[PDB]
Design a protein around this ligand. Sequence first.
Ligand SMILES: NC(=O)c1ccc[n+]([C@@H]2O[C@H](COP(=O)([O-])OP(=O)(O)OC[C@H]3O[C@@H](n4cnc5c(N)ncnc54)[C@H](O)[C@@H]3O)[C@@H](O)[C@H]2O)c1
Ligand SMILES: NC(=O)c1ccc[n+]([C@@H]2O[C@H](COP(=O)([O-])OP(=O)(O)OC[C@H]3O[C@@H](n4cnc5c(N)ncnc54)[C@H](O)[C@@H]3O)[C@@H](O)[C@H]2O)c1
Lengths: 329, 330
Amino acid sequence: MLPKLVITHRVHEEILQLLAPHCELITNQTDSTLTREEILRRCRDAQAMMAFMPDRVDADFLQACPELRVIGCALKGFDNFDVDACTARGVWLTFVPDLLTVPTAELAIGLAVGLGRHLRAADAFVRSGKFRGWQPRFYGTGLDNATVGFLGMGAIGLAMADRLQGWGATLQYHEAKALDTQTEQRLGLRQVACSELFASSDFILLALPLNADTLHLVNAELLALVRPGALLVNPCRGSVVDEAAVLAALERGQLGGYAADVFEMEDWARADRPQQIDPALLAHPNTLFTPHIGSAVRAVRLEIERCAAQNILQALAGERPINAVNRLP
Amino acid sequence: MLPKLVITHRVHEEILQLLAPHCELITNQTDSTLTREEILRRCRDAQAMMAFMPDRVDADFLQACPELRVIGCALKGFDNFDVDACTARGVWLTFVPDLLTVPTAELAIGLAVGLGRHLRAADAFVRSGKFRGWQPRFYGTGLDNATVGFLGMGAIGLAMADRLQGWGATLQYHEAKALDTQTEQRLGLRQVACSELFASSDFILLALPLNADTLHLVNAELLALVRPGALLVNPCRGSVVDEAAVLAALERGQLGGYAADVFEMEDWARADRPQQIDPALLAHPNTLFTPHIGSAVRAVRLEIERCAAQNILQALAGERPINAVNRLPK
Ligand SMILES: NC(=O)c1ccc[n+]([C@@H]2O[C@H](COP(=O)([O-])OP(=O)(O)OC[C@H]3O[C@@H](n4cnc5c(N)ncnc54)[C@H](O)[C@@H]3O)[C@@H](O)[C@H]2O)c1
Ligand SMILES: NC(=O)c1ccc[n+]([C@@H]2O[C@H](COP(=O)([O-])OP(=O)(O)OC[C@H]3O[C@@H](n4cnc5c(N)ncnc54)[C@H](O)[C@@H]3O)[C@@H](O)[C@H]2O)c1
């Protein structure tokens, strides 16, 4: 009897090969997410869990799964995992600190370009068969000579700033914890207050985690500050914005556009989360969406899976996992 | 009576005010493209013309318009304008050398990201109302650790290289006019042969003008060399590629994707040009398209128009235009 490991979502077969000598595997090698009932059934006597974005762990989950030694999260933002409750039950909780950063940064910039240049509608027009040559339309907004404001300047903020260096924009940021002035200057970043960031930015790129303090940070009052036509890009967590306020800002035309890779409906730890994305937001023309594909780059996903696998194996071996969030004796 | 200037497409009000005290303006302040005959009719007794991407000027056109002194083009690629015939008939042909570069480079990188990451299908999926959370789907290709190959390293090529500096890609290029080593080193560029460029690149970014030598340069023989899954992005001219060969490459699955801002049907100077984009190419999933919006940024278009206006005004005043493509004896 090897320790039992439940992997809640599909992974590369070579990751299964890496784990199999050490672990009895209970896998989900499909593109589907299992019911919460079935995850509980599988994890009841599991020694370990590899968890993904659709997963949620609270005290109630853990009491129902008394054999767990480690939850290895193949993700960065562990807002749906109660770390304190894990520590209390003697369960390691591990994450992936760096591997999701670059592909998410790349996508966020592509969304900003895609949103500013009306890519969805432009591509729709070409596919329709009615392109008859160059026309005066689909006039958009570029990054050259624009002010780009970042809310947050951790891993993804810095990766995005790195990638905008050749782009002719004026970069500013708001943080809970400032960069050192030397790094600011190497990247051409100026630190500003949050109100000013929203009042003065042509592109607003969110790069902050979801917590009690950032929940609905981007609300109606903050959005009412933006320059008419400002573009808002959300690659972080859905619930840092109030999507109802975002939609209202779009409909009034104060917000020029909203691009998102993440949605309030995904933030499982939120009882008052909406059950879906508002259909009126989904149908609004001044939008561009992706289904949480920030890290959806083939080579990176394998590396992310390997990182979670390694952390789990470290825990099961009686070591402190390299990427543990918590501390155990 | 002031000289007649035919402006073929809609122009910002700031530009008309600049032109009014110098020319009798025959304008087209609609967002519609007029017919070839309508242009001929208006230009028959015109001293000047402001021309745009849909316009084509050939030997017969200039013969029908003996009064022309200048054709100011609000564009970079003048492949639809017979420069030689302009020179022969003593007509200035002007362009806009730099203003289109940046917004086109921005869009091109945007297309590369969008194509690599399956943006069209991803967005359609969310819009369907069926998104229920993350799934291990839409896995694609990023620029980090990728090899990016530039065919051409002029204005747009250089601007794209500039904009990829922090992206962790290996940048290589082929050119007709090679960069000096110190510029190559400054941008982290490595010069390669065209065949090696196509054989070794994950992303192929086209940055060439269309001329006799570049017509169907990206053909079936060249596309046969690409790595499986290679992504091709075309922000320059449709006819630099053979769209039929591109489609065939997509269908066999050797080419991973094709993104384009420009299409063969736009290249009026070609008699054998296809009259539309192949419906089969339009319908292929591994594609991303824009309708020649490379420079479609409000601030930028105002400046492009002012540039073309300034060139026309300079010519009509008896000066040589700052952005003349051709040379005329004085
Ligand atoms: N879309 C995706 O696939 C994807 C991928 C990775 C991460 N994410 C999400 O993006 C978030 C940020 O990612 P990261 O890797 O940059 O995290 P990080 O922890 O490296 O950086 C987060 C930064 O936000 C700052 N911050 C906290 N509260 C703030 C506030 N009120 N105002 C301004 N800044 C504040 C923190 O000081 C920190 O520097 C993650 O927590 C995760 O939720 C999404
Ligand atoms: N999509 C748009 O809206 C848009 C905007 C601007 C320009 N364009 C098009 O893109 C083209 C390139 O633009 P640019 O501003 O970089 O022009 P450019 O003249 O500055 O650069 C073209 C470069 O390509 C090189 N070249 C020529 N033949 C080559 C070959 N066979 N192999 C490799 N390199 C070769 C030339 O030496 C030159 O350096 C323009 O001619 C125009 O047709 C499109």
